[PDB]
Amino acid sequence: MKTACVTGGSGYIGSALIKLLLEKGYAVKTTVRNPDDMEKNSHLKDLQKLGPLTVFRADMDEEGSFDDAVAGCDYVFLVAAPLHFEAQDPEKEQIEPAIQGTLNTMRSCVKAGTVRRVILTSSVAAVYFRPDLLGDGHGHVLDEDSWSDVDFLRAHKPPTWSHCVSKVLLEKEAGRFAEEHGISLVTILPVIVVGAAPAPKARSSIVDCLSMLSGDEAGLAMLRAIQKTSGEVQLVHVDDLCRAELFLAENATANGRYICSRYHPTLVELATFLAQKYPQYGVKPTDFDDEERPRVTMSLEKLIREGFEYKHNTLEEIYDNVVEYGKALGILPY
Amino acid sequence: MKTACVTGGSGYIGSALIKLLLEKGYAVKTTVRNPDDMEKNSHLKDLQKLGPLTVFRADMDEEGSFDDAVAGCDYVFLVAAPLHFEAQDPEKEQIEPAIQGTLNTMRSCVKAGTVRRVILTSSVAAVYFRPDLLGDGHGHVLDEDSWSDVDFLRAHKPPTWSHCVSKVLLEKEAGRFAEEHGISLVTILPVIVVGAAPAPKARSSIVDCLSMLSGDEAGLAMLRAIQKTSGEVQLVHVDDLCRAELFLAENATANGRYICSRYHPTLVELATFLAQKYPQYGVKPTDFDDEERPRVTMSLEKLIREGFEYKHNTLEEIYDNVVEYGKALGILPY
Numbered sequence: 293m294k295t296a297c298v299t300g301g302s303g304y305i306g307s308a309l310i311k312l313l314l315e316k317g318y319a320v321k322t323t324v325r326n327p328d329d330m331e332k333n334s335h336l337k338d339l340q341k342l343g344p345l346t347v348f349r350a351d352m353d354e355e356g357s358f359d360d361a362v363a364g365c366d367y368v369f370l371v372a373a374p375l376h377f378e379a380q381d382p383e384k385e386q387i388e389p390a391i392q393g394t395l396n397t398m399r400s401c402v403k404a405g406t407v408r409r410v411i412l413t414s415s416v417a418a419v420y421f422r423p424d425l426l427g428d429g430h431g432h433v434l435d436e437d438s439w440s441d442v443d444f445l446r447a448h449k450p451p452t453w454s455h456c457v458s459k460v461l462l463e464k465e466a467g468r469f470a471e472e473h474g475i476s477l478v479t480i481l482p483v484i485v486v487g488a489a490p491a492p493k494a495r496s497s498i499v500d501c502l503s504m505l506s507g508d509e510a511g512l513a514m515l516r517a518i519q520k521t522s523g524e525v526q527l528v529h530v531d532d533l534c535r536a537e538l539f540l541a542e543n544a545t546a547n548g549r550y551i552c553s554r555y556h557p558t559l560v561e562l563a564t565f566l567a568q569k570y571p572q573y574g575v576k577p578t579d580f581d582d583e584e585r586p587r588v589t590m591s592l593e594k595l596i597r598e599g600f601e602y603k604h605n606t607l608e609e610i611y612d613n614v615v616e617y618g619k620a621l622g623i624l625p626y
Numbered sequence: 627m628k629t630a631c632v633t634g635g636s637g638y639i640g641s642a643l644i645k646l647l648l649e650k651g652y653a654v655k656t657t658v659r660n661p662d663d664m665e666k667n668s669h670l671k672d673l674q675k676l677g678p679l680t681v682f683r684a685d686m687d688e689e690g691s692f693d694d695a696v697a698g699c700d701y702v703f704l705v706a707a708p709l710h711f712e713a714q715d716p717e718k719e720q721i722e723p724a725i726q727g728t729l730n731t732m733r734s735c736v737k738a739g740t741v742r743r744v745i746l747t748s749s750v751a752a753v754y755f756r757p758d759l760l761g762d763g764h765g766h767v768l769d770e771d772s773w774s775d776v777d778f779l780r781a782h783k784p785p786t787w788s789h790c791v792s793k794v795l796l797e798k799e800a801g802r803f804a805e806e807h808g809i810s811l812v813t814i815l816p817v818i819v820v821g822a823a824p825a826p827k828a829r830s831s832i833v834d835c836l837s838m839l840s841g842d843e844a845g846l847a848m849l850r851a852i853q854k855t856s857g858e859v860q861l862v863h864v865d866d867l868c869r870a871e872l873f874l875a876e877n878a879t880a881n882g883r884y885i886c887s888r889y890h891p892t893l894v895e896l897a898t899f900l901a902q903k904y905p906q907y908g909v910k911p912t913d914f915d916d917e918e919r920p921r922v923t924m925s926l927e928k929l930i931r932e933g934f935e936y937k938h939n940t941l942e943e944i945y946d947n948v949v950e951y952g953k954a955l956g957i958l959p960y
């Protein structure tokens with residue numbers, strides 16, 4: 293019986309991953325920042341009914357605090373990550389702490405002497421920002437060879453530039469470290485993640501993918517910004533991401549970084565689907581009418597090439613249970 | 627040096643397939659109905675400059691005529707197929723001939739004894755017609771397990787029903803024949819095929835994919851009918867199709883049937899791209915506005931999971947060279 297650690301069990305994806313790991317007969321270790329906070333961590337007790345689940349206190353800013361949680365683990369899923377904000381000095385308040393916090397947990401993995409693979413959860417935010425391809429007026433298909441352009445981002449500092457830089461640098465730094473330390477690191481790069489999860493305080497991409505139904509202004513801005521940039525948005529169901537994470541850990545031939553994405557609608561397609569299946573929210577699809585732009589899209593081929601299979605393949609399946617989740621979280625009024 | 631046969635050397639796809647095979651170092655043998663008709667076959671002389679290419683007279687209606695073309699071949703590419711017209715009795719003018727013509731060529735393969743694999747070019751017309759699904763208001767991803775509903779098509783005989791039936795029945799029959807005689811058969815199922823080819827008299831899908839530029843009523847009705855059914859069209863570059871055909875012949879473990887498709891635009895996406903890139907034709911994208919419908923789309927996983935790679939991945943790359951082909955053909959007036 294193998295043992296896996298999921299960092300940040302309080303979080304959206306982390307909670308879905310812990311559940312999947314238990315269903316597959318893994319013993320699971322997870323970290324939160326206050327194990328005594330049973331409002332935020334009630335799901336961790338329920339999940340104990342599926343298999344062995346142990347909770348630890350750890351913080352990415354606190355050197356060595358992950359030592360106990362990763363010890364004895366065959367696999368470690370680095371899911372926990374700091375929330376973004378507009379900081380007065382993003383280099384010092386975000387980019388550097390994101391690198392250092394990643395290395396911090398990397399050290400606990402080496403020290404554990406038992407970790408066969410580290411799976412790093414990053415983001416297509418580390419893939420898509422390409423000044424050439426985005427602005428040249430042509431369509432493009434990006435794959436795992438594409439990296440977000442740190443120099444252009446440091447040089448021009450568009451809003452939220454530090455989020456892409458942090459993902460790029462922490463991935464590079466963690467790979468450098470894994471090479472120099474003889475430990476196997478594989479990285480997954482999700483798009484917008486949709487679907488229900490055990491976490492009772494989840495927000496994150498649930499807010500964004502539901503914003504057409506809720507009217508959340510920041511969610512809608514995010515969706516429109518992505519569409520303005522790429523000609524569409526990209527979605528993946530949370531349970532396919534979790535299955536993809538497990539797949540990358542269990543297949544010895546897995547190597548490098550992997551985009552994780554499944555369905556790429558325009559906002560008007562997405563709004564028409566939501567308006568039709570969930571009319572009680574009053575979506576007006578014409579609010580998302582738009583000119584057809586060049587598609588700058590993520591390729592899904594690498595995971596497929598290697599044998600992975602997605603379970604939620606239509607738009608309806610990707611949205612199969614997220615609305616109910618939104619209601620139970622209060623993100624939706626009813 | 628391996629030898630391969632291609633039926634219908636004077637046709638769109640067959641001509642492109644000869645070019646690829648010669649480029650790849652095959653000796654090639656091809657059939658046309660009248661090797662002297664230079665109106666239709668002037669390209670064969672040009673192609674002979676690329677490598678060993680031999681022309682043969684054969685007709686699918688004429689039993690045993692393919693014996694000489696297929697002799698000595700390692701691989702046989704069944705591309706030639708009867709065109710679809712209205713017929714007082716499609717069952718006797720189109721369906722049964724399509725079946726018997728295929729079995730005719732299959733028998734020459736048995737006779738030759740050299741044939742390590744037959745590659746049949748069929749069509750997603752044998753995949754998509756799923757009336758249990760096309761009306762249900764949900765989206766669907768169809769795959770190689772999906773077969774067009776022969777019984778329902780015979781019952782209701784919608785326009786062009788005999789095409790899908792012909793494709794389905796001749797595929798099922800060739801598979802049974804191949805099984806009975808211990809010959810390996812693999813089938814490829816293209817969507818709409820785009821790109822330039824040697825054939826000097828091609829019409830076929832070149833008329834369709836170009837119909838927004840020429841205004842050809844049949845082609846436009848074709849494109850619209852596909853979108854009203856599936857909520858999108860599906861496209862592939864002729865050279866990716868030819869490369870997939872060669873991939874399936876050469877890779878031992880290839881088995882069964884294979885969808886071949888790469889880009890799935892709406893008509894309004896396609897028309898916007900074409901109006902921008904070829905403004906001389908006067909396309910108005912608003913002529914193709916449509917409400918978003920549920921997507922009934924083709925799965926791309928099978929070729930990909932078995933190692934194949936497409937090279938024309940953007941809409942623009944799929945249209946990289948077809949306009950100048952249509953101009954040279956007269957399909958486009960300028």
Ligand SMILES: NC(=O)c1ccc[n+]([C@@H]2O[C@H](COP(=O)([O-])OP(=O)(O)OC[C@H]3O[C@@H](n4cnc5c(N)ncnc54)[C@H](OP(=O)(O)O)[C@@H]3O)[C@@H](O)[C@H]2O)c1
Pocket residue numbers: 300301302303304305306324325326350351352353371372373374375413414415416481482483484485486494495496497498
């Ligand atoms: N959701 C998506 O659509 C999506 C898309 C692409 C990439 N991703 C990436 O997947 C990762 C998880 O995403 P998510 O949606 O699950 O967001 P999330 O719900 O906010 O989970 C992130 C977790 O990170 C923990 N964390 C933050 N700072 C920490 C620290 N200093 N020490 C220990 N833990 C800390 C947080 O725990 P606390 O409650 O204690 O703060 C939180 O639970 C992220 O790296 C994200 O960038 C997500």
Ligand SMILES: NC(=O)c1ccc[n+]([C@@H]2O[C@H](COP(=O)([O-])OP(=O)(O)OC[C@H]3O[C@@H](n4cnc5c(N)ncnc54)[C@H](OP(=O)(O)O)[C@@H]3O)[C@@H](O)[C@H]2O)c1
Pocket residue numbers: 634635636637638639640658659660684685686687705706707708709727747748749750751815816817818819820828829830831832
């Ligand atoms: N083009 C697409 O978008 C598309 C999409 C899906 C599937 N496909 C499949 O690919 C196949 C090839 O299509 P295509 O686009 O290359 O059309 P095409 O250019 O019209 O090729 C058809 C060839 O078949 C030959 N042929 C017809 N009847 C024959 C017979 N009784 N005996 C011998 N030869 C005969 C024809 O020779 P003659 O000219 O002398 O009659 C012609 O050269 C088709 O079977 C199609 O169903 C194509």
Ligand SMILES: O=C1c2c(O)cc(O)cc2O[C@H](c2ccc(O)c(O)c2)[C@H]1O
Pocket residue numbers: 415416417420482483484485496497498500514518522524525526527
């Ligand atoms: O860059 C991003 C991005 C993108 O460029 C293209 C695309 O198709 C999807 C995307 O989704 C990412 C995202 C959105 C909302 C979230 O709540 C989240 O965690 C991540 C976003 O950062």
Ligand SMILES: O=C1c2c(O)cc(O)cc2O[C@H](c2ccc(O)c(O)c2)[C@H]1O
Pocket residue numbers: 749750751754789816817818830831834852859860861
């Ligand atoms: O059903 C069809 C079809 C479809 O349903 C969906 C799709 O994405 C492409 C398609 O293209 C097929 C086709 C076009 C031209 C031909 O010459 C031919 O033989 C077949 C058509 O029949």
